[PDB]
Every structure is written in C-alpha cells, then in structure tokens.
From a paper:
PNP is a ubiquitous enzyme that reversibly converts purine nucleosides into nucleobases and α-pentose-1-phosphate, and is responsible for the regulation of nucleoside concentration within cells. The hexameric molecule of PNP from E. coli can be described as a trimer of dimers. The key role in the catalysis of natural enzyme substrates is played by Asp204, which is protonated, and by Arg217. Closing of the active site is a necessary step in catalysis; it brings Arg217 closer to Asp204 and enables the formation of a hydrogen bond between these residues, with deprotonation of Asp204 and protonation of N7 of the purine ring, which initiates catalysis.
Author numbering:
A (entry chain C), E (entry chain C): 1 to 225, 227 to 237
B (entry chain A), C (entry chain A), D (entry chain B), F (entry chain B): 1 to 237
C-alpha cells in the first residue's frame, strides 16, 4: 500500500487507463471490463481491474491537474509494477479546424507548470508520449474507422486562466487540445522509466461552441476508450 | 451549476471548510454538522451543507494540488456566494521540533508553483491568509486548549519531489508544513475577491519518515476541525 | 563594530524601530524617547537608544531599498542581539479607498526584487511578518483609536518604475502600499533568525498624485510611531 | 529571393533535406538525386533540387545551431512553399545502451535555448516532430533492415557547456542524442505551420568516447539519407 | 525640488560625482572643491556644488544599493539637467591579480538585480558605461601615473550573500570588483538618456585580505577622486 | 586538431579576424594579407594565416548565430593560443540617427540568448569587449577619417523574431546595431580568459529600410577590415 492507493502488488494490471473523474473510471470498468473488481477507494479515487478480450486491464481516476495525476502515476509505476499509463480525458480546442468530438492524441504536451523545469535544471524538457503507444492508438483508431489527430496538447495549471491571451498563442503554435495532466504524466514517465499516452476527446471549443447531442458525445467518449485496442496491439 | 459543482446558489453556506479528501468532507459533515445534506457529487468531490451550533456551514473536498483546489474555490466564490474558505488539510513537517498531529496555521504559503507568477507579472506575490481569519483560528485554538503554530506553509506541486535538497531550504526558512494547496487558494481568494485560510495537521515527518495511515487521515484530525468551526463563530462576531 | 555600524553589543536595545530616513530616526529619538543617546553615525545612518515608558528602545535609519536595509538589519541581528525590527516607513497607495496618512500593517510583502528567489532556490518565498508582532500592532492601534489596514505591501526596487501597468496588477491583488524594504527585511529576519514587521504611512497616491512634503515625511508621522512603540509594550507581556 | 536564399518560388521542392555541413548537400544531390540543378549559393550554403524515384526533392545545409537553422527553415517555409523539412545529421549519446552509429529519430527535442520560451510566453513548448514523418522514418528504416530509436533529442546552444552535470540529467530523463538544431526547427515548423523531423546517427558517446572510423561514417551517412528519402515516399502514401 | 532632493535647477553642475557615503561627499567637496555650497540634505544625503580648476562640479551621496542610487541619479537627470554621473566608490576583489588599492573602472556591470530585466523585457541588457567617460578616466589616470584596470564590475543586491558560490563564478568570468550600484546607474543612464561611469578602489579581497596602512588607503581614495580630471578632459 | 578545426597549434596567429560569411575569409586573406597560407577547411569554413605590415594575422569565418561562433572562438582560444578575436560584420539599426554604412563598435552586447545566464547562475552578465581593443578600433577609424559609434549591440537568437515590440525597447535603451554573435563571443572570451571585439557596419535600417547598394557594401566592408587590422597594430602599441 502507498499513501494514496490502498492496494497491493498484483492488484493492478501492467497497463492503467486513467480518466480525471473517479466516477468515469467506474463507468469504464462496468462498460468494458469483465470480472471487474474495485482495488482502490482512498480519497474516493476509484480504481478497478478486470479483463478486456482476456487481457488484464486496470482503470483508475487521477483527479484534476498535474500535481494530482503525478502522485497517482508515480505510485503506480514505482509500487504496483505498472508499465503503461493511458490518460483518457477531455480537452478544449483552440484551432478552428478541430471539431467537437474529434479524437486527439498527445504526442507532446506543452505546459505552464513548473514541474518539468524543476526536473530538468530549468531548461526545456519536451514532455512526450511513448512513440509505440502513440502508433498503437493511431492504428486502433484506424481499424475502428476513426481518424485521430496527433500533435501537441497544452496542460494548464489554471482551468480559469487570468491570461486569456495564451489561447491565441496555443492556436498560433498548433495546439490541438487544452487539458490539465498530460505534461505532468509524461514528466513522471520519463522520471521513473515508464511509458505514457494521453488521448482526449474535444468536449468544447474555447472560442465559439459548436453543437451536438448527448448520445453523440457519449458515443465518441466510448470510441476513445481506441485505448483498449491499442494495448492489444502493443502486446504484439 | 458550475462546470464542476452540480448545485445552485443557496446550497452552500457562505463559509466552506475544505479538506482535500472528499471522504473527509463526508466525515466532517456526519461528525460535526447537524441536518447535513449532500449538495454535490460531481467527480466524487462530495460537498455537504448543515449547521454547527445553529450556524449554516458547508464542507467539501477540493482534491489534491493547486490546480484542483483552484477550480473548486473559484466556482464556490463566483457562483455560490462563498465568502470564506477554510482549508483543513494534512502536511509534512521538516522542522525537528514539529511532531505528528501538530496543528499549523498558514498565515502565508510559499510555493514552487508558477500560478501566482502568472497572476503577478512574474514577480513575487506574497500568498497570505486573511488576517482576521488567522486570529480567529488562533483564539479558537487557545479557547480549546489546543496548541497551534502560525507561520509559512510550503505548497508543493510534486508530492514526490526530485529535489530533496529543497527540504533543507524549507527548514532553513522555517516552513512549518509542506502541503499542496494553500498558495493556490490564497491566490484565488485575492484574484476573485474573497478570504481564505489554511489549517493543516502534520500527518508525516519528511525527515523521520513517521506517517499516519490513510484511514487516520480521513477520520482522526478532529482538533483541526473544531478550531476551524469555532473560528467561524468568532468571525461572525 | 560591524562594517556599517560603529557600536558595540549592548548599545542597541533588543527592539529597533527603523525608518528609511536617518533624520526621521533622529526625530523619533528626540520626540518619543527619554535619555536618548546616539550610538551610530557611520554613513550618516543615525541610530539612537533610549527608553519609552521605561522600556529600552532603539531607533535607526535603514536607507532606501532592499539592499540598503538588508545590510543594517543583518548587522543588528547578528552582532547586536537585536530580536525585533519594526520598520516605520512611508508608502504610495494604489487602491481608491486608501487615502493619505492612512496606516498600513504589512502582514506580507510582495516584491519585484530577486533577493528572496536567490535565498529560496528560485521558488516563491512568502515574505511575511511575525504574527505576534502584527497582532500587537493591531491591538495598540485599536487602543490608540487609530485605524489600520492589515494586508500585503509591495516592496519595489524601482521607485521610478518603467512598468506603470504593474500598478494595475498591484491594485487588482489588493496591495495596500508600495514601499521599498519590507520584503527584504522579512527575508533577512527569516535567514538570520529574528522577527520583523513593517508599518507604513501612506505619503502619496500613485493614481491621484497627491503627496506629502519631504519635511512632513520626516516629522509628521506620529500615529505610526505611537503604534510601533506601544506594540512593543504589548509584546513584552 | 530572401535575405539568405537567392532563389525564386518554385526552385525548391516542397520537401527539403537539410544536413548541417553544407558540403554534404552537393554530395547528397550527386549521389541520391537525378537531374539535380543548383538553386542557391549565398554565403556558400549550396542548395539543389532534383528527383528521387520521380519525387521532387531539395537539399541544402542549415549551418550549426538553432539561430542558423531557424533562419533557413523559416525562409523556405514562408517564401518557397516548403511543407516538410528533414534535418539529417549526427548526435552525441549519453545513454549506456545507445551505441555508435545507431539511428535516432527525434520525436521531440529538449533544449537549453530560449527561443521557444520567447515564442510561448515563457511557458514550456514541447518541440515535436510531425508524427507521420516520424512513423515514415521508422518504417523506411525497418524496410532497410535498420532498427531506429524514437524519443527525445536535446538541442544544445553550447557545444562546450560549462555545466557538465547536465549530461547526467539528460541521461536520467532518457535523452537519446545531443545535437544543436532540432528544437529550433520544430519551433519554426509550429510557428509557420509546416512539418519537420530530425534524424541523427550517433557519432560519439559523451560517456567514454572511442568515436567511429571513416568508412563507417560513410556507410552510416548513406543509410540516414536513404532512410530520409524513402520516408518521404512513404509519406506520399 | 524632487521628493528626495530639496534643490532647484541650476543648483547642481551638469556632472555629479557620487560616493555611497554622504559623509564622503562632504569630504570630497571640502578637500577638492572651491566655494562649495551644500545644496541638499534631505534624508541626510548631503550634496554639494563648487568648482575644480574653475569648472563647476557637484558631489552627492547615493546611498547603498541599486534602488537607492537609482532614485538619486534619475532625479538628477530628469529634474536637474545632469548629463554625467561618476560613481566613485569601493569594491571587493575576487581575482588574485587584483590588489588592494588598485583603481578599477567599470566599463560594464554585471548584477543579480532584476531591475534591468524589468526594463528590457526579461532579456540581457549589457549595463555599460559611456565610452568617452571611460576613456577620459583612463587618460586622466595615466597623466597622474596611475594604471587603472578597465573591465566588469559586479553589482550585488546582497552585501551578505547566502550564496558564496557566486564569488567563484565572478572570478571565473573575470569580474574586477564587487560593489552594489554600477549596474543600476548604467540602467538609469540608458533609460533616461544620460552618461555614467563607475570608478572604484579595491578596499578588500573577498578571499584573503592583504595589508596596507590608513595613510596609503586614503591616498588611493584621493587618487580616484582621476574622476575630476576626466571631466576636464571630457570638456575637450 | 579540434572537432571543428583541422589544424595544429601554431597554424593560427594570436589574433583572428572573423567574418560571418565564410567566403569573406578568402577575400580578406587575398586582399589585405601577405604570404597567406590556408590552415583550415572543415565543413567549408576556410581559415588563413598571413601578415599585415609584418604582423601575423589569421582570418576565418564564424557562421551565423551565437552557438556557431561560440564553438569556433572557444576552440581557437583553448587549443590554438589565440588571444584576440575581432568579429567583423553587418548589423541592423533601430535608432533614427544611425545611418546606413555607419561603423558601430560593440563595447557591450545585449542578447535574448540564454548562454550567458547558463554561465552566470541565471544572473546578468554584462557581455563586454576588451576596452583596449575598443579604443584601438576607434583610433584606427579616426586615423582613416571614419567616425565610429561606440555602445551596445544586441545579439539576437532569432533573426525572424515574433516580438516586433522588442525593436522599440532596443531603440529606447540606445542599441546601436542588431546582429547575432557579439554577446556569445564576449561570453566565451570571458569564460576562457581572452579578449574580443565586434565591429559592424550598418547594412539596413529596421525602421523603414532602403538598403545599401553593391559598390557601397564593397567600400564599407574594406573600411571595416582596414579598421580592424590597423586596430591590431595600435594594440601592439
Ligand atoms: C479551458 C478549457 N478547458 C481548459 N481550459 N482546461 C481543461 C479542459 N478540459 C476541457 N476543457 C478544458
Ligand atoms: C512531503 C509530504 N507532503 C508533501 N511532500 N506534500 C504534501 C503533503 N501533504 C501531506 N504530506 C505532504
Ligand atoms: C511609488 C511610490 N512609492 C514607491 N513607488 N515606492 C516606494 C515608496 N515609498 C513611498 N512612496 C513610494
Ligand atoms: C556533445 C556532443 N555533441 C554535442 N554536445 N552537440 C552536438 C553534437 N553533434 C555531434 N556530437 C555532438
Ligand atoms: C563582498 C564585499 N563587498 C561586497 N560583497 N559588496 C560591496 C562591497 N564593497 C566593498 N566590498 C564589498
Ligand atoms: C534584424 C536585422 N538584422 C538582424 N535582425 N540580425 C542580424 C543582422 N545582420 C544584419 N541585419 C540584421
């Protein structure tokens, strides 16, 4: 057991899918995993282990923000044998050609957090996904007939930014989606020698809004959960 | 409703005690409040409203880290008429003369986050509590016979910090507790125009490596809660 | 003797009021102390020791700016047994509801100096006063019938700042007064192990451009001095 | 023409290979392209346009260092309709398991340069390659019987860095190769909306050394150019 | 009158010599200026105007540190018509070949202050003297048979540094003297369009100490006060 | 030999002239030196050693940008006993009174590069020339009937900067010329204990433009080389 996870080695699979919302982890285990057992409830951060097409898989919330997800991904890597983290989340778009319900894969993650500068002697650490995990996700999306955009996310510390001028900057430099975790998870994965990937669905357009239905949005969220099939591709 | 709270104006008291652990908010409402009703469960961040000695009072988790609690404290302040936030958390100690379950009152909060530099044009913003709230908490602690140190906390972004040497610097400058929120809450309170205070219980020593359990963290920090609730009463006078 | 003070251990009281203007220290000693003797004139930085209602008390200028007052507060703390520094200065106001001769108590001090980043590994050090000293000053002000706001000061390196827009940011974040020392004094107190507090009199408004004379700045700020001296008396209890 | 390229729109293919050493451009054009024509000579930075298996390709050196290649890549993109840039060159390795003449593909590039912080309001821009170009290079290498590593480069401003400890940090965080351009090319690509990739062969080990021979550095260069060119044809799909 | 100088246009010469110590300004007026009148005493920061070989010259303290001297040099430039500031001060040496009582001329001034980054959009502003003033000082020292070193000073914010490792850095990069004002004065002079020069005598060796006599040290201080003759050379 | 210079100790004079454009080195050697011999050719960066009025001089180009010239100047100083480096090149002007083909001598060099902050523990290093070399150049120019301005250069990392407002700041603080190397050469000179100077002719005005012709840029280049070479003889005293 670690200070934020009341579990033991073996309780997690060597791959963990992580949404921000602990209730969304419950949704995923119940919708997609067979024989799911709950393996953590400390601080309400529900985590589960079951099987997908016979493959052992865990899913667990990571909370909002780089500091929260850094705790959980660290402890999973160093104390529960986890090799792969797949964040499965929502993001806001700044580019006009990125539409509601697009699937975005973060090959890199920009940030206004200081955590990677602290790690990297105040220089620029390029916070990146594991390439093979990216490729597995692109291929799994193709097999399902979904086109995924691959590029940069931006991991914000302030959901409610006082700036607002920073969204123009993100647009100018081609940021595909704004969320709050990827850069921290990629930093954790480099620091402790594991592999990580962030996939997001566009849940709003920070400029404008666009228009869809609940059924359509929930369909795309389930499409993202690509993540499970990418694991199977990785297993080779 | 706000993007992270499914409630309406009036569901929250004008004062909200906030631990990081939503299960601890649930424990506070069951143990200390009367007629406690649940007013939020979005993302599992349980929030409750009830009364303490007749005073309407809410309690709601804020999650771990400056970005998490920044979301919740903002929405409480801008859409639910919340005037005072009292964070009631845990912290790790670096000073030798600070032992487990000691109560610390962060008049100020150091940080290695960039959020206040982003608000303050890259200068030093002294993240501070409301003075009257600090004094209320000190007086309530004296009336309860509970010791409490008043000083600087350090709000860390990395619970698992790769810079162990920074603990020596925290120690040198008298930091009473390492937690993960205060400096961001004080920044929100200033940005959005309310008042805040962080009280913490020392739950582990970073040097001695003695620590309290996860079950103890959510259900044994009762002195802190009493200080927090009684300090509201003094503030209402 | 230290490199900037020609005196010996015992010449200073354990509490030193310090304005920036050495002529103001001279005025304080003549007007408020009894049996005042001069204990330093190096570089014209006049310092005096006497008694206030029987309590040994010193007063000495610290010069303008964080680097100037850092020298003097350091030497007082490390070679003259000084335990408490009470800065008694002037400040410029940015908030509309803050008028000339208002008294401000800096529980914290923002700054655009780099000195605390250099002490604190480039992180945010919340430069704060001693809590008991702040409360002493608040209580002494109430007993004297003098209003006083408690909050953040901003310690500027550039009196003539080329960034006028930073005043808007100070205003947004509730900065009660722009002066040039508090954040450095609070940093010295923490580094070298003593306690400090800055009290300031609003001597000009940065927006309205109303200002007090240079002669008024050195001889009309009497309410502040009374608060400072009486707060020491409360602290001795 | 532009300040550093004396040519007209249309003289360059939409894909440009860029070695560092400008003398290698003429080599590539004569060894791997058909029907090559000279399209630039300003300050000895020779450029050529030709075909590889019918596909229009240009090649031109970029100089050493982020400021140099930032100039040439910008002008190609904004004034010559270039859509893809492939930098081909050498790097030094810090990882014990990365060996001399290994092929490294920079999906990302760390840097100690300030150029991206100037672009990105002093936040962290992740300087990344175009994903399809990365994958094209991996597959083209595979088809040539070459396993290629994919991960982070580090683009150093100072070949002779005074901070020997940074190489240990690079190794801790998995940096595959040290060179001097990738992060700057990636930033320009993002700034003006084109696509870029850096491929490097390991020419030396910062740990120990025992560098490579002459015919080995000839075989290995040819493999890298072959990989880059076949990757373009894969990108055409 | 300005907020820190109780004087009027005309009261100062268009060149001001400035030591840190207001008592040292009094010493200089009394030792070197004819018909000296005191023209400022606000905050005890004594300033004087007299003549040197018939040339009108002022001298005035500037206090310790960049923030203090920035106030006084600013107000002198924008409100009293001053064109040239010559700081005349003491510095500590870090180089082993820089000896006690060497005369050091700051063609540039390094600093750990943030004031020039604030002025210069967070980039590196090279805080420099006016070249002609440097050359006049070198020539005046030569005519007096004194060899002056010209190079970098370092302007510290903390006389009592918590670092201490920074002195090795200054030594490595050839810093001739450590004081507390030059970089701020050069920043003021660029910002408001005036000219400035810092001359220092080495009053200690931050490593080791060396050994001289009071009479010898006071002789070298008077040699520095070079400054007066450099003005006359500047007048052409 | 060094990684970028295939030569031996003694092949270079103790004084090296460095243009940016490497093709200018052969020009200088053939036009102003006697008995010139080729001493380097690695990646087309030709170097030559000869005499000017009996004085041994070398010339070799430095590439564009701080990282490029930092490599070559370092290796010359640490491995070829070089004592003085004179960079000769062009710059852009922001000041209305600085005119095309004016000669500018960089007593100091501002920069938006991070290299000196990496050297100087993130403080402000003033990147400065050697004073005697400055004065030698002024006097040599005077003797040729050329008035030369002396002050600050700005060494830009990005020729194509995304912050158009920085040119206004440069103009406010008196920058005489914008180029891309001076501050980096000055930092290397200080790091390894040698002497350096950058001389520039104004080739364009950032304000407006209306650049210079061909025979004008020929006359002006020759004047700059003449100034640099006569300045060396003045330095020999
Ligand atoms: C603006 C929007 N936004 C954000 N800032 N951060 C995270 C996020 N997730 C969905 N939408 C988001
Ligand atoms: C070491 C300990 N520690 C920490 N670092 N950060 C936050 C925190 N909360 C309780 N204990 C904590
Ligand atoms: C504007 C005003 N102002 C200032 N900036 N800094 C320090 C200070 N002391 C009194 N008044 C002050
Ligand atoms: C150490 C090594 N090294 C470097 N630093 N930078 C660029 C580069 N290219 C090959 N080898 C290199
Ligand atoms: C160490 C020494 N030192 C200093 N730091 N700063 C200014 C100064 N003037 C003389 N000696 C000095
Ligand atoms: C604008 C202009 N400019 C520049 N930025 N950098 C270097 C340079 N050399 C000549 N002209 C230049």
């Amino acid at each position: 057991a670690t200070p934020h996870i009341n579990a033991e080695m073996g309780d997690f699979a060597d791959v963990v899918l992580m949404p921000g919302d602990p209730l969304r982890a419950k949704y995923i285990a119940e919708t997609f995993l067979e024989d799911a057992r709950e393996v953590n409830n400390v601080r309400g951060m529900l985590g589960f282990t079951g099987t997908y097409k016979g493959r052992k898989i865990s899913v667990m919330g990571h909370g909002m923000g780089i500091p929260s997800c850094s705790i959980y991904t660290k402890e999973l890597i160093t104390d529960f044998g986890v090799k792969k983290i797949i964040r499965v989340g929502s993001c806001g778009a700044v580019l006009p050609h990125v539409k509601l319900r697009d699937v975005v894969i973060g090959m890199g993650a920009c940030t206004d957090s200081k955590v990677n500068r602290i790690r990297f002697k105040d220089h620029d650490f390029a916070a990146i996904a594991d390439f093979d995990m990216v490729r597995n996700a692109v291929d799994a999306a193709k097999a399902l007939g979904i086109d995924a955009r691959v590029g940069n996310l931006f991991s914000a510390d302030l959901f409610y930014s006082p700036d607002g001028e920073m969204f123009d900057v993100m647009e100018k430099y081609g940021i595909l989606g704004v969320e709050m975790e990827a850069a921290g998870i990629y930093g954790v994965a480099a620091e402790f020698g594991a592999k990580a990937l962030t996939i997001c669905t566009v849940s709003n357009h920070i400029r404008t809004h666009e228009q869809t239905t609940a059924a359509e949005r929930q369909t795309t969220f389930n499409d993202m959960i690509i993540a499970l099939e990418s694991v199977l591709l990785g297993d080779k």
